[PDB]
């Protein structure tokens, strides 16, 4: 309703960098809010793309941002009669960013890895990797849970079981309130998908530079499966956390698997041991149900609700025809130990190929009426096809079926405005939570400030 | 296999000193080296991994440095607990190989050994054997040589030596030497002697007895 | 006596006609004192209204073009007729309806283009062997149905990019099969091989020179190839006047839109041709797989009948995709493609067994209803599609157009076309809501309140603007 | 807290085999490589091999090919070392080792399992007194414990009363049996006026001889 679409703030990265592909709010040790921005095609030291991360101080005028520097150099270690190798070319550093406490986690899902031993090798594969920074201290760490030193032949002899070579760890990421990093790795276990978790504190204390393969003993990974429903399911394409079992000392994980069961798609809610508590099945094959997931209590009963995006959902129209528009599903959490039901609300796109539901950001309570609200991105939506973000307000029965506000892209065609979204943080300290919108195709991010309701 | 030559094999140092132990590998091992500590009669604790990284719990008076084939463990300001054995290990290649070790011992003023000699007991002789014992007690430094003589001529066969570790609250070493003969052989000779050669005296400490006579 | 035309109390000739289609208006100068000017045509004549002064439009439908249906789809290049009539003129007065007919024929001996688009991942090696005489064998079977067959060939694996592609050691790029004990082609996305031709031994000989490649993950990049085979018109060589069959053969699941992000590709598919002179799809590594909606749009625009010829292990998957891409047909391919000939002939038969009417550019105010005559001169009301037809069959539909009120524009046109057909019925509509006497009105008339009003069709009307 | 807890001292005959265990405590044995290392006083430290208990894949120094077999059971959180066709030179202390962080390192060690390979039957020691020869103000006595198997022996003086100025020497193995000696030093007024007795207990043979030191 009350985001200001007249006086925006723009931050800009280098041309071709995809600045804005990912973003998050970051609070420093003093509560000063900054914006962390991923730019996964930023050029590295060999004038080759490796990605980068920027940490933008809050200014109404916006502008250029300083880099948050990470080591962009390929590493080699000869040890244990093996040769360990990292390859950061085209790794996509900043394809996901997330902030927690005074720490920033920025991931490079396409970082490649190999191990040589005489004439054999592990195979050069995209294990992915995450880089962790504490900006104020300069501390740096890394976490790459899918690196191994097993040779190609042993996977073949063991029927490709527990094959983490194509994980793409960091493809999606989230940090629990207690500070456990949870990474989605949609290529894990030969394209089934996996989740990897470890406390941030243990990531920092276990890392040393140059080691490349090290143990983070408090870590926990999900499991391989023999069930074809999971094959090529990309479980971990999106991740979120929330409270869904009524027990406030356990944190539950929400995981999107948008090609689960022969492209039907699914989202699963699990406990922290990766045991499945609920599964939401997609409605339409190829809709990419699970592309995005969001967790927020929208109806003011103190129980977290789930939103799921299916950006390629085709809506039925006159004369037995179908129109790709995208859809968002709201599932309200019932009282007590019961199943999440059918959806409580379906929100459906209008613009053909608009990809409504491609991103869903909790906004907190934007209009200050006691119900949390959401923003849904349609990156190619709007009457001009340039991208739209739509705000829907919470209410006692769930969400309103009609947007309170629509933000049309201020950028040119092709910007992908809305592909990344983040809300629920008051960046200017005016007592209303604000919205940051990435437009990676324009290498920019737009800040919408919430203002008093008119 | 990669040979690891560790030096020195031992050093006599004191509390507060800064001491370095070096390890030279037969080829470059790119900091794939660990350092280990074995206290007297106890198991091993890791000190350093990958050249320079302290194992959790290890005090920062320990530091590791070096590169290529040449590495060092430095201990700044030795505690009483630091007097122990130290070993390097490389893991650049299988098989993993270790240094021959370095024992830190306590330095002190030189002390001559108290030499005592004991003929066989009645109990042993009537059983059929004859052991002559010499104790060389409370000496420093540890480097010592014992020689047995029967009727003035050196005897080398049938000798059994034992050394104590450095003593806990005077820092001296002790040694036991036992010449065992058959009773019948013991009785072919009269004179039995052990000679301790030590850096404190240029001439040895001779201790002797004559059989039957007392 | 007082009918609906008289009881309204109309002020003008135009308001008279808009009351009901049976109302007429009399423009006679000397009409009696209080006689109703808007009444039934019978009542006006009976009250001595001059024969030339009766305004009474009748709704009609006359044919403008009515070529007879062709008996053969052969001959010319191409002037075949499959929809009759092809142009009619409708005149409609307000709120009135009029009926008309359309005849549609699945014509015998119509040209056919068959583009064979094949999965050439490693599990299809034995399939390549099976189909090396497919060109000639298919020619033989299709000769019974058509005298103008063209056939062509393209192949696909997946996007040649990690993690789909093996990228180490260097040998693996040149020969993906190096760690097995054999040799295969470097990885490719989609390559066009043989432009549609009537020279079928060209198919045999090209297929004999083809070979498989090898990639890592089960789902393949065939939807990229369906898109390119569809929008690269001139390269694939689809003919304007022919049935277009795109035979898609695979034994595996398929990558779909938004899968590309596992290879770092986020650019949406643009639906354009990117197969140049080297005959390979040049955007394979830079553009995402296409969505079903985009594929559907292009298949429909270029009039392509997609056939999913897939193995039993993925038949349910492709049947379900088929339901989301209307007009698509599915056939069960054997594990070595040994039954693909019969599968193609059966699909062609299924493709030409339906007639489904589509209406384009229908004005808001117009609404149509349809009664269908398929099978046995048997009328199925409220239906605009026939099924279970054979080649040669003819069907017809009764169509009623009803206009609601009278629109601002008096001339509009719309098209009734069967889906997939070249020919169509163009309906030219004329809304006849005006009287002929309006075009000879007298403004600023001495007869009407001393120059204040206009004299039209016998009565005085308030002028502009009172 | 990470601890490797190894099985107790083994005492076996030559030609036999023995299976040493190493149980992980405070962690899953599956987490890292587990190694085995051999220590002798003369030859020092030698890497035997390693195992990855997750999958059972092993590596060995080729010197131990045939002798050493390393296995693991994740169910019991334990790793094993089997040594076959035992010999005198297999007498050593055996350690299981795992890294802290670095996959390839050698940071945490178990307490060590002692292996002794011998044909010696359980044999009771002979305890011989050692009185001096027929002078000074400082005097020194002794005790020789000869020909026992196995170790250890607890040696004390006057039921552990006299402890200062005492030196008990490490047992030495000479032809299948052990020998040990102990000296005690006092002022010449004390002895032989006040009594001094050598108390030697050998738990294995269940003998506790007590020999009084008499002069000549
Ligand atoms: C292609 O598309 C088809 C059609 O959509 C899919 O087939 C359907 O698959 C779903 C899910 O597997 C099935 O749904 C099930 O319905 C059952 C009840 O009705 C059917 O019962 C029998 C089967 O037992 C059918 O033969 C018959 O058609 C009935 O209509 C329920 O028993 C099932 O409920 C159980 O599982 C669900 C999770 O799916 C739980 O929520 C429930 O609590 C319960 O445990 C289930 O709802 C359905 O049978 C199928 N429909 C048809 C028409 O066959 C294919 O899977 C799909 N294939 C591919 C490759 O995409
Ligand atoms: C299609 O057939 C239906 C019959 O089911 C026709 O409906 C009837 O039309 C006649 C015309 O004389 C009327 O007398 C009947 O009252 C109608 N019955 C209805 C509407 O239920 C209809 O006219 C036909 N439609 C077309 C487009 O040909
Ligand atoms: C319309 O239908 C009638 C029967 O209701 C039929 O006789 C007539 O021929 C049809 N008119 C046209 C123009 O097709
Ligand atoms: Ca919980
Ligand atoms: Ca709720
Ligand atoms: Ca609100
Ligand atoms: Ca604000
Ligand atoms: Ca096959
Ligand atoms: Ca593939
Ligand atoms: Mg395949």
- Distance from the Cα of A83 to chain B's closest Cα (Å) equals 10
State residue C173 phi and psi, 5-degree precision: -70, -45
Residue pair D182/D168 in contact (Cβ under 8 Å)? The answer is yes
Say if residue C50 is in the same domain as residue C127: no
**Chain A interface, mutation test: which of B28, B30, B56, B90, most A Cβ atoms within 10 Å?**
B30
Helix extents (H) in A225-357: 260-263
Of A154, A158, A215, the CB nearest to D99: A215
Q: Is A24 annotated as a binding residue?
A: no
Q: Which domain holds residue D115?
A: 1-119
Say if residue C271 is in the same domain as residue C299: yes
Tokens 């109806």 identify what position? A299
The two structure tokens encoding residue A420: 């990344």
Distance CA B97, CA B101 (A): 12
- Number of other residues whose CB lies within 10 A of the CB of residue C195: 17
- Restricting to A residues 212-251, those with a Cβ less than 8 Å away from any Cβ of C are 231-232, 234, 237
Residue to substitute in C398, C401, C425 for testing ligand 3 pocket (most ligand atoms within 8 angstroms of CB) = C398
Distance CA C256, CA C270 (A): 14
Beta strands in A247-318 (DSSP E): 252-257, 266-270, 276-281, 292-296, 305-310, 314-317
Residue pair A280/A343 in contact (Cβ under 8 Å)? The answer is no
Distance CA A363, CA A436 (A): 10
- Distance from the Cα of B108 to chain A's closest Cα (Å) equals 41
Torsion of CA D80, D84, D90, D91, to 10 degrees: 70
Distance CA C148, CA C134 (A): 17
Which of A238, A249, A175, A274 lies closest to A419, judged by CA? Answer: A238
Of B30, B50, B93, the CB nearest to A81: B93
Q: Is C158 annotated as a binding residue?
A: yes
Partners of D104 on chain A (C-beta within 8 Å) are 79-80, 213
Kindly state the helix (H) or strand (E) to which residue C222 belongs, with its residue range: helix C222-231
CATH code (residue C38): 3.30.1680.10
- Distance from the Cα of B39 to chain A's closest Cα (Å) equals 27
Residue B119 to residue D106, Cβ atoms within 8 A:
no
Q: Is C20 annotated as a binding residue?
A: no
CATH code (residue C464): 2.60.40.1510
Q: For ligand 3, is residue C61 a contact (CB within 6 Å)?
A: yes
Residue D103 to residue A208, Cβ atoms within 8 A:
no
The two structure tokens encoding residue A182: 């949870």
Say if residue C335 is in the same domain as residue C382: no
What SS3 class is residue D35? strand
Asked if A209 is an interface residue toward chain B (Cβ–Cβ < 8 A), one would say no
Q: Indicate the residue among C324, C355, C386 that finishes a domain.
A: C355
The two structure tokens encoding residue B137: 């007690």
Q: Which domain holds residue C77?
A: 58-106+356-466
Q: Indicate the residue among D119, D140, D172 that finishes a domain.
A: D119
Residue pair D206/D123 in contact (Cβ under 8 Å)? The answer is no
Burial B18-31 (b: 16+ CB within 10 A, else e): ebebbbbbeeebbb
Q: Which domains does chain B have, with CATH numbers?
A: 1-107 (2.60.40.10), 108-211 (2.60.40.10)
Residue pair C344/C138 in contact (Cβ under 8 Å)? The answer is yes
Residue D208 CA to its chain's centroid (Å): 21
- Number of other residues whose CB lies within 10 A of the CB of residue A158: 12
Half-sphere exposure of C396 (CA within 13 A, CB side): 12
All chains having 3 or more CB pairs closer than 8 angstroms to chain A: B, C, D
In what side-by-side order are the strands of the sheet with D3-6?
A: D3-6, D18-25, D78-83, D68-73
Q: Indicate the residue among D119, D143, D177 that finishes a domain.
A: D119
Distance CA C130, CA C128 (A): 6
Distance CA C127, CA C134 (A): 11
Say if residue C185 is in the same domain as residue C312: yes
Say if residue C196 is in the same domain as residue C212: yes
Residue A127 CA to its chain's centroid (Å): 17
Written as one string, the DSSP assignment of B77-116 is S--GGG-SEEEEEE-SSSSPEE---EEEEE----B--EEE
Ligand closest to the CA atom of residue C370: 2
Report the DSSP beta bridge partners of residue B148: B155, B194
Partners of A80 on chain B (C-beta within 8 Å) are 91-94
CATH code (residue C217): 3.40.50.410
Say if residue D68 is in the same domain as residue D107: yes
Residue B53 to residue A78, Cβ atoms within 8 A:
no
Residue B116 to residue D132, Cβ atoms within 8 A:
yes
Angle separating helix axes C134-142 and C340-351, nearest 10 degrees: 40
Task: Map out the domains of chain A as residue ranges.
Answer: 1-454
Residue D103 to residue A217, Cβ atoms within 8 A:
no
Which of A195, A165, A191 lies closest to A183, judged by CA? Answer: A195
Say if residue C99 is in the same domain as residue C213: no
Distance CA C434, CA C410 (A): 9
Ligand 2 centroid to Cα of residue C95, in Å, is 17
Q: How far is CA D63 from CA D21, D59, D67, D89, in A?
A: 21, 12, 9, 13
Of C168, C216, C256, the CB nearest to A263: C256
Q: How far is CA D14 from CA B104, D41, D117, D186, in A?
A: 36, 20, 6, 44
Say if residue D20 is in the same domain as residue D75: yes
Ligand 4 centroid to Cα of residue A339, in Å, is 15
**Chain D interface, mutation test: which of B121, B161, B168, B169, most D Cβ atoms within 10 Å?**
B121
Of C259, C264, C293, the CB nearest to A92: C264
Say if residue C442 is in the same domain as residue C368: yes
The two structure tokens encoding residue B169: 């609250």
Q: Indicate the residue among D119, D137, D153 that finishes a domain.
A: D119
The total domain count for chain C is: 3
Q: State the resolution, in angstroms.
A: 2.3
All chains having 3 or more CB pairs closer than 8 angstroms to chain B: A, D
Q: For ligand 2, is residue C136 a contact (CB within 6 Å)?
A: no
Partners of A232 on chain C (C-beta within 8 Å) are 217-219, 253
Q: Indicate the residue among C320, C338, C355 that finishes a domain.
A: C355
Of D47, D131, D179, the CB nearest to B97: D47
Give the method used.
X-ray
- Residue D156: partners with Cβ closer than 8 Å, 6 or more residues away: D163, D199, D201
Kindly state the helix (H) or strand (E) to which residue C127 belongs, with its residue range: helix C125-130
Distance CA A179, CA A105 (A): 11
Q: Which CATH architecture has domain A1-454?
A: 7 Propeller (2.130)
- Residue A430: partners with Cβ closer than 8 Å, 6 or more residues away: A449, A450, A451
Ligand 4 centroid to Cα of residue A305, in Å, is 13
Distance CA D131, CA C400 (A): 138
Say if residue D75 is in the same domain as residue D148: no
Helix extents (H) in chain B: 122-127, 183-186
The two structure tokens encoding residue C219: 């789902």
Which of C170, C88, C223 lies closest to A121, judged by CA? Answer: C170
In what side-by-side order are the strands of the sheet with D207-212?
A: D154-157, D197-202, D207-212
The CA angle A2-A8-A11, to the nearest 5 degrees, is: 135
Half-sphere exposure of C160 (CA within 13 A, CB side): 19
The two structure tokens encoding residue C379: 């009328």
Torsion of CA B144, B145, B146, B151, to 10 degrees: -140
Say if residue C384 is in the same domain as residue C439: yes
Quick check: do B and C touch, 3+ CB pairs under 8 A? no
Q: For ligand 2, is residue C212 a contact (CB within 6 Å)?
A: no
Partners of D53 on chain A (C-beta within 8 Å) are none
The two structure tokens encoding residue C104: 């549609």
Distance CA A132, CA A107 (A): 8
Residue/partner pairs of A148-153 with CB below 8 Å, 24 or more apart: A148/A115, A148/A122, A148/A213, A149/A80, A149/A82, A149/A84, A149/A115, A149/A122, A149/A213, A149/D103, A150/A115, A150/A122, A151/A115, A151/A117, A151/A120, A151/A121, A151/A122, A152/A120, A152/A121, A152/A122, A152/A123, A152/C179, A153/A120
- Restricting to A residues 77-136, those with a Cβ less than 8 Å away from any Cβ of C are 90, 92, 110, 112, 114, 121, 123-126
Ligand 7 centroid to Cα of residue C37, in Å, is 72
What SS3 class is residue C451? coil
The two structure tokens encoding residue C198: 């009537």
> Which residue from A minimizes the CA distance to D103?
A214
Residue D129 to residue B123, Cβ atoms within 8 A:
yes
Report how many Cβ contacts below 8 Å link chain A to chain B: 19
The total domain count for chain D is: 2
Written as one string, the DSSP assignment of C67-106 is PPPPSBS-SSSS----EES-EEEEEE-TT-EEEEEEEEE-
CATH code (residue D147): 2.60.40.10
């Amino acid at each position: 309703l009350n985001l200001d679409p007249v006086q925006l703030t723009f931050y800009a990265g280098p041309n071709g960098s995809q600045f804005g592909f990912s973003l998050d709010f970051h609070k420093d040790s003093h509560g000063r809010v900054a914006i962390v921005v991923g730019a996964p095609r930023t050029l590295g030291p060999s004038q080759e793309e490796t990605g980068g991360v920027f940490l933008c101080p809050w200014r109404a005028e916006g502008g250029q941002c300083p880099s948050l520097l990470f080591d962009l150099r390929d590493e080699t270690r000869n040890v244990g009669s093996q040769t360990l190798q990292t390859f950061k070319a085209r790794q996509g550093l900043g394809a996901s960013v997330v902030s927690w406490s005074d720490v920033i986690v920025a991931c490079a899902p396409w970082q490649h890895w190999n191990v040589l031993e005489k004439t054999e090798e592990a195979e050069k594969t995209p294990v992915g990797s995450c880089f962790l920074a504490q900006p104020e201290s300069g501390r740096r760490a890394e976490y790459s849970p899918c690196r191994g030193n097993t040779l190609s032949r042993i996977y073949v002899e063991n029927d490709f079981s527990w094959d983490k070579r194509y994980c793409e760890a960091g493809f999606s990421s989230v940090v629990t309130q207690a500070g456990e990093l949870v990474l989605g790795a949609p290529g894990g276990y030969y394209f089934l998908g996996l989740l990897a978790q470890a406390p941030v504190a243990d990531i920092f204390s276990s890392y040393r530079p140059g080691i490349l393969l090290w143990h983070v003993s408090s870590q926990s990974l999900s499991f391989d499966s023999s069930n074809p429903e999971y094959f090529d399911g990309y479980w971990g394409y999106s991740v979120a956390v929330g409270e869904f079992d009524g027990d406030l000392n356990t944190t539950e994980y929400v995981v999107g698997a948008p090609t689960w069961s022969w492209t039907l798609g699914a989202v699963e809610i699990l406990d922290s041991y990766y045991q499945r508590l609920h599964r939401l099945r997609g409605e339409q094959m190829a809709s990419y149900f699970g592309h995005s997931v969001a967790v927020t209590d929208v109806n003011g009963d103190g129980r977290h609700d789930l939103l799921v995006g299916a950006p390629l959902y085709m809506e039925s129209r006159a004369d037995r025809k179908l129109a790709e528009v995208g859809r968002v599903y709201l599932f309200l959490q019932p009282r007590g130990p019961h199943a999440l039901g059918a959806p409580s609300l379906l929100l459906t796109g209008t613009q053909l190929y608009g990809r409504f539901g491609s991103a869903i950001a909790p906004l907190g309570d934007l209009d200050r009426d006691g119900y949390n609200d959401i923003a849904v991105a349609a990156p190619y939506g709007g009457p001009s096809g340039r991208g739209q973000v739509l705000v829907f307000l919470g209410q006692s029965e769930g969400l309103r079926s009609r947007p309170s506000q629509v933000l049309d892209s201020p950028f040119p065609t092709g910007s992908a405005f809305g592909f990344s979204l983040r809300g629920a943080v008051d960046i200017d300290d005016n007592g209303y939570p604000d919205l940051i919108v990435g437009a990676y195709g324009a290498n920019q991010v737009a800040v919408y400030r919430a203002q008093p309701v008119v | 296999d990669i040979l690891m030559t560790q030096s020195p094999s031992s050093m006599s140092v004191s509390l507060g000193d800064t001491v370095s132990i070096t390890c030279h590998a037969s080829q470059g091992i790119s900091s794939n080296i660990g350092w280990l500590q074995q206290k007297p009669g106890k198991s091993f604790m890791g000190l350093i991994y990958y050249g320079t990284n302290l194992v959790d719990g290890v005090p920062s008076r320990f530091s590791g440095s070096g590169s290529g084939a040449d590495y060092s463990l430095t201990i700044s300001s030795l505690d009483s607990e630091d007097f122990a054995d130290y070993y390097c290990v490389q893991y650049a290649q299988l098989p993993y190989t270790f240094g021959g070790g370095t024992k830190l011992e306590i330095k002190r003023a030189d002390a001559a050994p108290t030499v005592s000699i004991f003929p066989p007991s009645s109990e042993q002789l009537t059983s059929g054997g004859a052991s002559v014992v010499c104790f060389l007690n409370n000496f420093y430094p540890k480097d010592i040589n014992v020689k047995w003589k029967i009727d003035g001529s050196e005897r080398q066969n049938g000798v059994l030596n034992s050394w104590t570790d450095q003593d806990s609250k005077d820092s001296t070493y002790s040694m036991s030497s036992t010449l065992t003969l058959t009773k019948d052989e013991y009785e072919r000779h009269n004179s039995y002697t052990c000679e301790a050669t030590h850096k404190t005296s240029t001439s040895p400490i001779v201790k002797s007895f004559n059989r039957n006579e007392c | 006596g007082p009918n609906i035309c008289t009881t309204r109390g109309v002020s003008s000739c135009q308001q008279c006609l808009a009351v009901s289609p049976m109302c007429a208006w009399c423009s006679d100068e000397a009409l009696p004192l209080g006689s109703p000017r808007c009444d039934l045509k019978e009542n006006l004549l009976k009250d001595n209204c001059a024969p030339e002064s009766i305004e009474f439009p009748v709704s009609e439908a006359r044919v403008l073009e009515d070529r007879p249906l062709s008996d053969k789809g052969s001959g010319d290049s191409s002037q075949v007729t499959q929809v009759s009539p092809q142009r009619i003129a409708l005149r409609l007065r307000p709120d009135d309806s009029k009926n008309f007919s359309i005849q549609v024929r699945q014509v015998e001996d119509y040209p056919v283009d068959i583009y064979y688009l094949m999965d050439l991942s490693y599990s299809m090696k034995d399939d390549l062997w099976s189909i090396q005489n497919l060109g000639t064998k298919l020619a033989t079977q299709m000769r019974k149905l058509t005298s103008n067959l063209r056939i062509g060939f393209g192949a696909f694996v997946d996007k040649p990019v990690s993690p789909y592609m093996y990228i180490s050691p260097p040998e693996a790029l040149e020969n993906p099969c190096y760690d097995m004990k054999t040799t295969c082609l470097p990885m490719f996305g989609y390559k066009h091989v043989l432009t549609l031709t009537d020279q079928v031994t060209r198919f045999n000989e090209e297929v004999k020179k083809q070979s498989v490649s090898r990639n890592r993950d089960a789902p393949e990049g065939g939807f990229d190839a369906i898109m390119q085979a569809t929008v690269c018109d001139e390269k694939i060589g689809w003919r304007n006047d022919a049935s277009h069959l795109l035979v898609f053969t695979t034994d595996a699941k398929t990558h779909i839109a938004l899968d590309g992000r596992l290879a770092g590709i986020v650019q949406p598919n643009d639906g354009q041709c990117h197969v140049g002179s080297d005959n390979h799809y040049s955007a394979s590594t830079t553009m995402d797989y296409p969505s079903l909606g985009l594929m559907t749009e292009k298949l429909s625009q270029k009039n392509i009948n997609l056939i999913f010829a897939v193995t039993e292990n993925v038949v349910n998957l492709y049947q379900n995709y088929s339901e989301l891409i209307p007009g698509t047909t599915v056939g069960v391919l054997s594990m070595d493609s040994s039954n693909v000939l019969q599968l193609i002939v059966d699909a062609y038969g299924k493709i030409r067994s339906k007639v489904e009417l589509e209406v384009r550019d229908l004005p808001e105010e117009l609404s149509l209803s349809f009664n269908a005559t398929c099978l046995n001169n048997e009328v199925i009301p409220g239906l605009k599609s026939c099924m279970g037809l054979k080649i040669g069959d003819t069907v017809s539909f009764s169509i009623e157009a009803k206009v609601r009120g009278c629109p601002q524009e008096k001339e509009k046109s719309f098209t009734i076309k069967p889906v997939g057909f070249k020919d169509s019925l163009i309906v030219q509509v004329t809304f006849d809501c005006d009287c002929a006497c309006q075009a000879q009105a007298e403004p600023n008339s001495h007869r009407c309140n001393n120059g204040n009003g206009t004299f039209e069709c016998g009565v005085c009307r308030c002028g502009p603007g009172w | 807290e990470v601890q490797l807890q190894q099985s107790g001292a083994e005492l076996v005959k030559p030609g036999a085999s023995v299976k040493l265990s190493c149980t992980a405590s405070g962690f899953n044995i599956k987490d890292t490589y587990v190694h085995w290392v051999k220590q002798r006083p003369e030859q020092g430290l030698e890497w035997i091999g390693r195992i990855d208990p997750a999958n059972g894949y092993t590596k060995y120094d080729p010197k131990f090919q045939g002798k050493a077999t390393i296995t693991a059971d994740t169910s019991s959180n334990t790793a094993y070392l089997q040594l076959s066709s035992l010999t005198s030179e297999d007498t050593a202390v055996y350690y299981c080792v795992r890294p802290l962080y670095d996959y390839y390192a050698m940071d945490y060690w178990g307490q060590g399992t002692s292996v002794t390979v011998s044909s010696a039957k359980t044999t009771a020691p002979s305890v011989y007194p050692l009185a001096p020869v027929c002078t000074g103000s400082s005097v020194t006595l002794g005790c020789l414990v000869k020909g026992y198997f196995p170790e250890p022996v607890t040696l004390t003086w006057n039921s552990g009363s006299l402890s200062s100025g005492v030196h008990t020497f490490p047992a030495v193995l000479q032809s299948d049996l052990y020998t040990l000696s102990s000296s005690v030093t006092v002022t010449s007024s004390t002895w032989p006026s006040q009594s001094i007795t050598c108390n030697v207990a050998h738990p294995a043979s269940s003998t506790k001889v007590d020999k009084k030191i008499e002069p000549r």
